[PDB]
Design a protein around this nucleic acid. Structure first.
Lengths: 104, 85, 82, 205, 123, 262
RNA sequence: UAGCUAGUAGGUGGGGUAACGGCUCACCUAGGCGACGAUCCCUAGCUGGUCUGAGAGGAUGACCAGCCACACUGGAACUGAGACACGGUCCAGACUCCUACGGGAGGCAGCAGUGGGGAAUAUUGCACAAUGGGCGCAAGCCUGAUGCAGCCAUGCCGCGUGUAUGAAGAAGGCCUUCGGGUUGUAAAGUACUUUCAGCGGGGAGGAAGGGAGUAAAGUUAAUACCUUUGCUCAUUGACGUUACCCGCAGAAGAAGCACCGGCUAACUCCGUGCCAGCAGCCGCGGUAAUACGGAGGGUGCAAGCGUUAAUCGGAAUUACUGGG
C-alpha cells in the first residue's frame, strides 16, 4: 500500500475525439470551470487542479485533412471520449475514428 | 530583483534611521556650541564643549566618525573657545 | 590579503602552474606582485621538474602571506632535510 | 599533401633524374628523357631568370618531396641560423627522417621510405616516429622494430644500397637494419648538382 | 627642406580615398537590384553590357555589372554585390556574385567555376 | 457536470504499452516518454518545438538524466514544463501518468524512444505519406532566412515536410492534408513575415523517401544529377513527377536499409 | 574655430572630505588661459602590445594582461575599510506583463538562446575532478570564472588519400605533314604494406589533498582535548566509448581549386565573330583568338584554392634619415 502506486491509480487519460463542428473547445473550456482552473488549429493539454484524481486532457484538430495528430496520440491515451451531434450523426469521421480505436 | 540576499537591504534600512539619528543628535550638540559662539559666553561655551566632547568621542569610537573628523571638530572648536576666552 | 597561490597557465590539456604572490581580490591570471618558482604537474622524471626559491617565500611568510594547500604541499616537497 | 601521381613525368619536366623512379631496376630510358616533358615539349623556351629560379626550386622540392608552405617554413628556419642560409637549408632538408631512411637503403624510392616511416616501422632512439618531417638530431640511431623487420620489402631494396654512393655522414649495419646517424653533411658532399643560390634568390624577393 | 616650416606645420600624409564606398570596409553588400538594362561601354569596347542599378540596403545607390552569360533578373531578385571596378563603364565599380542569392549560376560552365558560382559536374 | 463522476468511477489504471520485447507496466522504472508531436508552436521569443511524453511509468526527478535511445546519448534534462490550465507553468515534477513539455532545438523527431538503458523501440508512428501541393516562390524577396530556418523548424513535424530542390528556388511545402492555410496563417508570426500566395503547380505523388546502403547510391546520385532534391532532415527521396519515374526507380534496383521517416 | 572665463584667477575667515584642495559659503582685488593652438566642432577607451617595414616610420590595439568608464536613460542618498553600486534602494521617463484593475513585476553591454540588423560569427551541454574566489576551526556548500565537451577548414601545423614492378609503349580523348606524337608507368596485371577512419581489448597522466585508525614530539596537573610529522586502510575524474599500445579485415573510406599574351609559372584545336564575353594595368575579340566559351595538355597551391574588403612595403609618389 505504497502511495506511489496509489497515485499511479489517480492518473487517468481522456483526450477527446469527435466530428467537425461538434464542440471539443466548449466542453474543454467548461471542464476548466469544473476544477477551479476556420476552426480548431491547435493542440492543448490540461493536467488539472481537480479534487479526487488528476485526469489529463489532450486536444486535437478534428477534420479529415487535419487529425494526423490523433492517429498517434490515441495511442497515447488509454480511454476515449466520443462527441456525436444528432444533426451530423454517425459519419465517415466517426467511422475512421472507430477504425482507429478498434485496433487497441 | 528576486534574491535570497535582500536581507542586507532592509537591515540597512534598520541602519539609516538609528545610527544617522545618533549622527543627528551629535551634530545638534555641535550646533549648540555654535550658539555659544553666537552668544559670547565663554563659560557656557566651555560647558557646551564639555557636554559635546564625550558623545563625539563615543561616536568616533563606534565607527560612524573616522576619529579625524571629530578631531578636527575638537581642534577648531577648542581654537574658537580659547580665542573667545 | 596577500597569498601565495597557483595561476594555472599552459595549453589545453597541458597544465603548467605558476606559484606566485598576489592579492586575493585579483584574478587567477590577473595582477601579481612578483613571481617565484613554478610547478609542472605533468612533469615526469627528467632534468627538471620543479623550481622553488624558498628565500622570497620566507620573506613573504615574514610579511603575512597566507599559504594555500598546494603551495604548502610543494613546501613539504622541497624539504629542508631531504 | 603527397603528390601520388606521375613521378617519372617530373624527371622529364626538369630534365635531370630526380630519383623518384630509382627502384630495383637501373636507369630506364623508357620515357624518352630530355626530349619530351609533355605534349609540346619539342619547343625551346625563353627560359628567363624567374624561370630558372622556379625550375630549380621545383626541382629541389620534387627531389625532397616537400610542399611549398613547408619549404617556406624550412627557409624561415634556415634564415635565422648561423653560417649561411644555403648550406643550412639543405642541411634541414637532409635532416628529414624519410630522407635518412632513403639514404640508409631502407626502401627503393623516397615515397617507399615515407610509407615505411608512416606505417609505424621506423624507430629512432627506441621511440617510433610516424611523421616523415622528423628533424633528426645528431648522434641518433635509427632501426626497424621486430614486428615489421624484413618482410622482404626492406631486403631487395637494400641491394640498391649496394649500388649507391653510400655517403660518409651515416652508417648502416646491414645485418640487423640498425642505422647510425652522425655529424651534419657538408655542402660539397650532397649530390654535387643542385643550386641553393636560385632558391635564395626566389625566397629573397 | 626648410625644417622650421616642418616644425610649424607637420608633414601630412595624403589620405587616398577608397575605390569602393562600401560603408567602413566590408567585402560584400546586398541590395534591392532594380533597373536591369544593357549599356554601351566607354571608348575602346563597343559591346552591350548588362548592368543593374542596385539600391543597397544601407541607402547607397550603386550600379553593378552583371557578368556571365544569361540571367533571370526582372526588377527584383535580391542578390549579393562585390567590389572591384570594371574599367568598362563610367560609374560602374562593382560586380555581381553568382552562386549567391536569387540569381542562379551560369548554365553549362566547366572551367573557372569558383567564379560565376558553377558547381562541379556531378555526372 | 455529471461527466466527472463517470471519469472517476469508470476509467481504469493506465494500461501497459507494447514494446519490441513485451508490455511495460505502470509500476516499473526507466521512463518511457517518447515524443508524439512536435506541434506548430506559438512563438513568443523562442520555439522549443514541444515534447509531449508517455511518462506513465516512473515518478519524475528534478535532476534526472534521460537517455536518447536512437542516438544512444546520455542527455541531462532538468527543465520540464507542466501544462497547468493551459499555461506553460514553472519547473515542476509530478506523479507518473502525466504528459510534459520540454525544450528541443532540432534534435528529437517523432517517436524517439527513451529509457534508462532498455535499448528497445515501441510499435508507434502511424503517420502517412503526403500529397504534394504547390511551392514557395518568395513574394517580397527580402530576407529569405526566416523561411530557410522557420519552415525547416516546421519540416520536422508530421504535417509539414519541406522539400528543397537543387535549383535553390521553388521549394515545395509538404502537406498530407489539403488545407495549407495553416502554414499561410503561421507565416504571420514574430519570426515569419513572407506571404507566398498560392497558385496551381503540378508535382504529383508524395516523394517516396529512400536512402540506400553505401558504395551503391553514389552512381545513383551521379547518373541523374538534375533529378535530386534535398528533404527536411537532409534526405533525398528520388523526385516524384509521375508513376512511370517511380517504376523506373524500382527498375533501377536501389537495395536499401529502409526507414520510412513518415 | 581667435578670443575664452564671473566660482572665473588669487588671498582671508567659516564649513566639509579617511586627506591638501573655490570641494563648498561671507568679504577684498582683477586677475587666469592663449598663436610653443586658449574656447568650439568631429572622431576615439588608453597602454603593454599586433601587422608590415633593414632601420626610421605607418595603420591597429580583436584575443592575453594593467588602468578607466558603464550596467534600459538620468539624478540622488544609506551600509561599510572600500559602491555615490551588473544580478542593492528610491524617484522621474520609455517599452512589455499580470490584475480581483485598488496596485505591482522586469531590466542578458553574464553564460546559453531568440527577434531585428548585417556578407559575417556557436550549445538554452558536463562538473567543482584541479586552480582560484566567498563562508565555516574543519568536514562540507556555491562558483555559466574555470577545467572541459559540441559546432565552424576561421588561422597555423602535421599526416593520409598507396608503394615497388609493370609496354602491346593496350582502349578512349586531343593534335597532325595523318609518318606519328601526347595523355602515359598513367591505367589494367603482379607482389607487399596499412599512417589516419571502422571494430574488438588493455591503458597512464592531469591527483595534490581530505576521512578513519596507530605511534612519536609539543601543550598542560594530565598518558584526556588540540597543533605538527611519519606510518596502516578505504578512497576522491566532467573530460573518458581519453592520450598511448596490441589484434581483425581489406588499397580497401578519403583531391580538389586557380591560371596558361606580357607583368608572372605554362601550348594547341573547335564554336562563334568589337557579338557572346574576359580583365588587377597594358589591354583582346571586325570569320585562321597562345586572351571569350568548350576539349586536350601543362603550370602553381594543396584540404585547401580563387575573388572581394582593410594595413604596410615596393612608394625616396609627403623626402627627419630620404625631393624640389
Amino acid at each position: 500500500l505504497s502511495p506511489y502506486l496509489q497515485e499511479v491509480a489517480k492518473r487517468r487519460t481522456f483526450a477527446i475525439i469527435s466530428h467537425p463542428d461538434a464542440g471539443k473547445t466548449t466542453i474543454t473550456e467548461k471542464v476548466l470551470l469544473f476544477g477551479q482552473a476556420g476552426i480548431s488549429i491547435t493542440t492543448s493539454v490540461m493536467q488539472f487542479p481537480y479534487h479526487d484524481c488528476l485526469v489529463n486532457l489532450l486536444d486535437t484538430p478534428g477534420h479529415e485533412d487535419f487529425s494526423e495528430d490523433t492517429y498517434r496520440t490515441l495511442t497515447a491515451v488509454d480511454c476515449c471520449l466520443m462527441v456525436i451531434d444528432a444533426a451530423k450523426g454517425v459519419e465517415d469521421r466517426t467511422r475512421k475514428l472507430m477504425e482507429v480505436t478498434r485496433l487497441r | 530583483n528576486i534574491k535570497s540576499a535582500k536581507k542586507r537591504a532592509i537591515q540597512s534600512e534598520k541602519a539609516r534611521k538609528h545610527n544617522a539619528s545618533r549622527r543627528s543628535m551629535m551634530r545638534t550638540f555641535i550646533k549648540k556650541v555654535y550658539a555659544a559662539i553666537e552668544a559670547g559666553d565663554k563659560a557656557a561655551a566651555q560647558k557646551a564643549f564639555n557636554e559635546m566632547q564625550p558623545i563625539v568621542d563615543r561616536q568616533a569610537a563606534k565607527g560612524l566618525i573616522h576619529k579625524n573628523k571629530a578631531a578636527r571638530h575638537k581642534a577648531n572648536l577648542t581654537a574658537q573657545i580659547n580665542k573667545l576666552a | 590579503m596577500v597569498t601565495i597561490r597557483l595561476a594555472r597557465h599552459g595549453a589545453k590539456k597541458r597544465p603548467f602552474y605558476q606559484v606566485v604572490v598576489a592579492d586575493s581580490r585579483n584574478a587567477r591570471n590577473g595582477r601579481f606582485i612578483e613571481r617565484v618558482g613554478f610547478f609542472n604537474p605533468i612533469a615526469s622524471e627528467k632534468e627538471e621538474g620543479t623550481r622553488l626559491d624558498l628565500d622570497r617565500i620566507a620573506h613573504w611568510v615574514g610579511q603575512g602571506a597566507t599559504i594555500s594547500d598546494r603551495v604548502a604541499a610543494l613546501i613539504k616537497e622541497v624539504n629542508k632535510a631531504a | 599533401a603527397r603528390y601520388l601521381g606521375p613521378k617519372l613525368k617530373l624527371s622529364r619536366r626538369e630534365g635531370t633524374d630526380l630519383f623518384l623512379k630509382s627502384g630495383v631496376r637501373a636507369i630506364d630510358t623508357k620515357c624518352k628523357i630530355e626530349q619530351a616533358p609533355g605534349q609540346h615539349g619539342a619547343r625551346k623556351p625563353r627560359l628567363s631568370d624567374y624561370g630558372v629560379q622556379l625550375r630549380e626550386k621545383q626541382k629541389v622540392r620534387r627531389i625532397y618531396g616537400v610542399l611549398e608552405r613547408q619549404f617556406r617554413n624550412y627557409y624561415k628556419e634556415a634564415a635565422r641560423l648561423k653560417g649561411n642560409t644555403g648550406e643550412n637549408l639543405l642541411a634541414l632538408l637532409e635532416g628529414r627522417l624519410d630522407n635518412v631512411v632513403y639514404r640508409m637503403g631502407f626502401g627503393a624510392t623516397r615515397a617507399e621510405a615515407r610509407q615505411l616511416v608512416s606505417h609505424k616501422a621506423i624507430m629512432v632512439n627506441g621511440r617510433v616516429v610516424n611523421i616523415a618531417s622528423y628533424q633528426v638530431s645528431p648522434n641518433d640511431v635509427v632501426s626497424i622494430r621486430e614486428k615489421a623487420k624484413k618482410q622482404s620489402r626492406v631486403k631487395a631494396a637494400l641491394e640498391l644500397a649496394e649500388q649507391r654512393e653510400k655517403p660518409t655522414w651515416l652508417e648502416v649495419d646491414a645485418g640487423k637494419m640498425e642505422g647510425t646517424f652522425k655529424r651534419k653533411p657538408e655542402r660539397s658532399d650532397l649530390s654535387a648538382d643542385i643550386n641553393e643560390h636560385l632558391i635564395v634568390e626566389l625566397y629573397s624577393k | 627642406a626648410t625644417v622650421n616650416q616642418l616644425v610649424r606645420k607637420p608633414r601630412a600624409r595624403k589620405v587616398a580615398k577608397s575605390n569602393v564606398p562600401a560603408l567602413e570596409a566590408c567585402p560584400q553588400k546586398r541590395g534591392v537590384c532594380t533597373r536591369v538594362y544593357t549599356t554601351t561601354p566607354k571608348k575602346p569596347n563597343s559591346a552591350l553590357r548588362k548592368v543593374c542599378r542596385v539600391r543597397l540596403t544601407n541607402g547607397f545607390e550603386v550600379t553593378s555589372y552583371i557578368g556571365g552569360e544569361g540571367h533571370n533578373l526582372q526588377e527584383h531578385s535580391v542578390i549579393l554585390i562585390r567590389g572591384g571596378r570594371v574599367k568598362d563603364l563610367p560609374g560602374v565599380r562593382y560586380h555581381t556574385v553568382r552562386g549567391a542569392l536569387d540569381c542562379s549560376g551560369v548554365k553549362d560552365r566547366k572551367q573557372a567555376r569558383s567564379k560565376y558560382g558553377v558547381k562541379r559536374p556531378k555526372a | 457536470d455529471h461527466m466527472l463522476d463517470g471519469l472517476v468511477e469508470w476509467a481504469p489504471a493506465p494500461m501497459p504499452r507494447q514494446t519490441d520485447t513485451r508490455t511495460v507496466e505502470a509500476s516499473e522504472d526507466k521512463f518511457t516518454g517518447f515524443v508524439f508531436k512536435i506541434q506548430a508552436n506559438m512563438d513568443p521569443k523562442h520555439r522549443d518545438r514541444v515534447a509531449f511524453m508517455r511518462v506513465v511509468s516512473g515518478k519524475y526527478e528534478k535532476g534526472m538524466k534521460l537517455r536518447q535511445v536512437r542516438t544512444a546519448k546520455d542527455v541531462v534534462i532538468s527543465d520540464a514544463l507542466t501544462f497547468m490550465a493551459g499555461d506553460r507553468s514553472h519547473v515542476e515534477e509530478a506523479y507518473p501518468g502525466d504528459i510534459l513539455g520540454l525544450h528541443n532545438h532540432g534534435t528529437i523527431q517523432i517517436g524517439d524512444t527513451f529509457t534508462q538503458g532498455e535499448m528497445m523501440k515501441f510499435t508507434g508512428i502511424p503517420n502517412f505519406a503526403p500529397e504534394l501541393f504547390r511551392r514557395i516562390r518568395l513574394k517580397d524577396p527580402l530576407k529569405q532566412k526566416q523561411l530557410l530556418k522557420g519552415l525547416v523548424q516546421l519540416s520536422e513535424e508530421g504535417a509539414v515536410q519541406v522539400f528543397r530542390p537543387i535549383s535553390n528556388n521553388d521549394l515545395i511545402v509538404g502537406a498530407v492534408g489539403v488545407l495549407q492555410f495553416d502554414v499561410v496563417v503561421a507565416r504571420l508570426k514574430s519570426e515569419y513575415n513572407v506571404e507566398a500566395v498560392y497558385e496551381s503547380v503540378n508535382v504529383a505523388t508524395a516523394r517516396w523517401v529512400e536512402c540506400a546502403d553505401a558504395k551503391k547510391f553514389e552512381e545513383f546520385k551521379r547518373k541523374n544529377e538534375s533529378q535530386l532534391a534535398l528533404d527536411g532532415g537532409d534526405n533525398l527521396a528520388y523526385i516524384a513527377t509521375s508513376m512511370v519515374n517511380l517504376r523506373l526507380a524500382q527498375e533501377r534496383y536501389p537495395d536499401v536499409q529502409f526507414h520510412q521517416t513518415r
